[PDB]
Design an enzyme around this catalytic site. Structure first.
Site, PDB file in Angstrom:
ATOM      1  N   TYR A 189     -20.888 -40.115  29.204  1.00  0.00           N
ATOM      2  CA  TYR A 189     -20.078 -39.082  29.812  1.00  0.00           C
ATOM      3  C   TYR A 189     -20.270 -37.726  29.146  1.00  0.00           C
ATOM      4  O   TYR A 189     -20.694 -37.629  27.991  1.00  0.00           O
ATOM      5  CB  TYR A 189     -18.581 -39.471  29.833  1.00  0.00           C
ATOM      6  CG  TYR A 189     -17.886 -39.381  28.474  1.00  0.00           C
ATOM      7  CD1 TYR A 189     -17.905 -40.497  27.665  1.00  0.00           C
ATOM      8  CD2 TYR A 189     -17.275 -38.203  28.057  1.00  0.00           C
ATOM      9  CE1 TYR A 189     -17.322 -40.437  26.419  1.00  0.00           C
ATOM     10  CE2 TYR A 189     -16.692 -38.132  26.811  1.00  0.00           C
ATOM     11  CZ  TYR A 189     -16.733 -39.262  26.000  1.00  0.00           C
ATOM     12  OH  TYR A 189     -16.183 -39.232  24.746  1.00  0.00           O
ATOM     13  N   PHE A 208     -16.079 -29.965  26.424  1.00  0.00           N
ATOM     14  CA  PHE A 208     -15.374 -30.319  25.218  1.00  0.00           C
ATOM     15  C   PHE A 208     -15.940 -31.597  24.606  1.00  0.00           C
ATOM     16  O   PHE A 208     -15.661 -31.862  23.438  1.00  0.00           O
ATOM     17  CB  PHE A 208     -13.841 -30.415  25.462  1.00  0.00           C
ATOM     18  CG  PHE A 208     -13.394 -31.422  26.506  1.00  0.00           C
ATOM     19  CD1 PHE A 208     -13.367 -32.782  26.230  1.00  0.00           C
ATOM     20  CD2 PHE A 208     -13.048 -30.959  27.762  1.00  0.00           C
ATOM     21  CE1 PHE A 208     -13.032 -33.670  27.238  1.00  0.00           C
ATOM     22  CE2 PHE A 208     -12.701 -31.855  28.752  1.00  0.00           C
ATOM     23  CZ  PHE A 208     -12.710 -33.207  28.498  1.00  0.00           C
ATOM     24  N   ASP A 209     -16.697 -32.451  25.323  1.00  0.00           N
ATOM     25  CA  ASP A 209     -17.226 -33.682  24.728  1.00  0.00           C
ATOM     26  C   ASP A 209     -18.381 -34.287  25.520  1.00  0.00           C
ATOM     27  O   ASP A 209     -18.477 -34.060  26.725  1.00  0.00           O
ATOM     28  CB  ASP A 209     -16.105 -34.716  24.566  1.00  0.00           C
ATOM     29  CG  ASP A 209     -16.433 -35.897  23.664  1.00  0.00           C
ATOM     30  OD1 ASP A 209     -17.356 -35.828  22.866  1.00  0.00           O
ATOM     31  OD2 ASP A 209     -15.755 -36.908  23.755  1.00  0.00           O
ATOM     32  N   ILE A 252      -7.296 -42.474  29.968  1.00  0.00           N
ATOM     33  CA  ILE A 252      -6.492 -41.793  30.966  1.00  0.00           C
ATOM     34  C   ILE A 252      -6.615 -42.417  32.342  1.00  0.00           C
ATOM     35  O   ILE A 252      -7.635 -43.023  32.701  1.00  0.00           O
ATOM     36  CB  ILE A 252      -6.794 -40.270  31.014  1.00  0.00           C
ATOM     37  CG1 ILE A 252      -8.274 -39.981  31.354  1.00  0.00           C
ATOM     38  CG2 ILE A 252      -6.330 -39.634  29.701  1.00  0.00           C
ATOM     39  CD1 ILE A 252      -8.640 -38.518  31.535  1.00  0.00           C
ATOM     40  N   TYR A 291      -3.985 -35.448  30.928  1.00  0.00           N
ATOM     41  CA  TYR A 291      -3.042 -35.256  29.836  1.00  0.00           C
ATOM     42  C   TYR A 291      -1.793 -34.485  30.202  1.00  0.00           C
ATOM     43  O   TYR A 291      -0.980 -34.174  29.324  1.00  0.00           O
ATOM     44  CB  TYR A 291      -3.780 -34.563  28.669  1.00  0.00           C
ATOM     45  CG  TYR A 291      -4.944 -35.378  28.102  1.00  0.00           C
ATOM     46  CD1 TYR A 291      -4.696 -36.475  27.286  1.00  0.00           C
ATOM     47  CD2 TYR A 291      -6.239 -35.065  28.472  1.00  0.00           C
ATOM     48  CE1 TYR A 291      -5.737 -37.296  26.876  1.00  0.00           C
ATOM     49  CE2 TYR A 291      -7.290 -35.876  28.059  1.00  0.00           C
ATOM     50  CZ  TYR A 291      -7.024 -36.983  27.265  1.00  0.00           C
ATOM     51  OH  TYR A 291      -8.056 -37.771  26.839  1.00  0.00           O
ATOM     52  N   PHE A 339     -15.381 -34.817  34.644  1.00  0.00           N
ATOM     53  CA  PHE A 339     -16.278 -35.658  33.870  1.00  0.00           C
ATOM     54  C   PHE A 339     -17.508 -36.035  34.682  1.00  0.00           C
ATOM     55  O   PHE A 339     -17.420 -36.354  35.869  1.00  0.00           O
ATOM     56  CB  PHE A 339     -15.602 -36.951  33.383  1.00  0.00           C
ATOM     57  CG  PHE A 339     -14.595 -36.754  32.257  1.00  0.00           C
ATOM     58  CD1 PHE A 339     -13.271 -36.441  32.560  1.00  0.00           C
ATOM     59  CD2 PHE A 339     -14.984 -36.971  30.928  1.00  0.00           C
ATOM     60  CE1 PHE A 339     -12.329 -36.391  31.544  1.00  0.00           C
ATOM     61  CE2 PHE A 339     -14.031 -36.899  29.933  1.00  0.00           C
ATOM     62  CZ  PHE A 339     -12.710 -36.615  30.234  1.00  0.00           C
TER      63      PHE A 339
END
EC number: 5.2.1.8
Lengths: 94, 107
Positions: B26, B36-37, B56, B82, B99
């Site tokens: 991912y 962010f990742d 999530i 979130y 994502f």
């Protein structure tokens, strides 16, 4: 009380992360993590303790340096850095 | 909710079951914002067990409709991600997440 270091860390990280991320309780998260680190500090006394310390000792010691950084800095980014190393351990143990 | 848009098709037959380990790559970013990742950076695939509430809600529902081999863009509303609190230090309140997820393998 007989418990493998693999088990005590998997349960301890799980519980400490719940207190910190779920409950916003940093005091309770330290209370959980300090005795785990203090056992690594004493040193491995079984072959199974030794191989756990060989694979994860350095990461866990680094997670503790970040936590100690946070103690002195007050900056929550230092504690996140500790949780990235704790989660990598937790996943490897899992 | 979660919208799943296909980047590359999977086999259309092998879908995760509750309790299976999904092995994925991912990249995550904020909607029209910062990446962010990414597990790709790390050269290590991410694994999680479907149905255990480890991740999530948007991932639980999003990945469940993917088949092995599929790569998809998942757009996840804040209530499936979130929410009003965000993820401290990383994701702000009320962020929509996108994502890119590739379902590599089931174990």
């Amino acid at each position: 009380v007989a418990i493998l270091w693999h088990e005590m860390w998997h349960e301890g990280l799980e519980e400490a992360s719940r207190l910190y991320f779920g409950e916003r309780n940093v005091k309770g998260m330290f209370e959980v993590l300090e005795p785990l680190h203090a056992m690594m500090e004493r040193g491995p006394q079984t072959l199974k303790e030794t191989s756990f310390n060989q694979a994860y000792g350095r990461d866990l010691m680094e997670a503790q340096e970040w936590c100690r950084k946070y103690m002195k800095s007050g900056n929550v980014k230092d504690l996140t850095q500790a949780w990235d190393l704790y989660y990598h351990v937790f996943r490897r143990i899992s | 909710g979660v919208q799943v848009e296909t980047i590359s098709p999977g086999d259309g037959r092998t879908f995760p079951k509750r309790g299976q380990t999904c092995v994925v790559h991912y990249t995550g970013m904020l909607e029209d914002g910062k990446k962010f990742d990414s597990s790709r950076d790390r050269n290590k695939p991410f694994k999680f067990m479907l149905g255990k509430q480890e991740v999530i809600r948007g991932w639980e529902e999003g990945v469940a409709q993917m088949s092995v081999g599929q790569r998809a863009k998942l757009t996840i509303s804040p209530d499936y991600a979130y929410g009003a609190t965000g993820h401290p230090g990383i994701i702000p309140p009320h962020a929509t997440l996108v994502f890119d997820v590739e379902l590599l393998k089931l174990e």
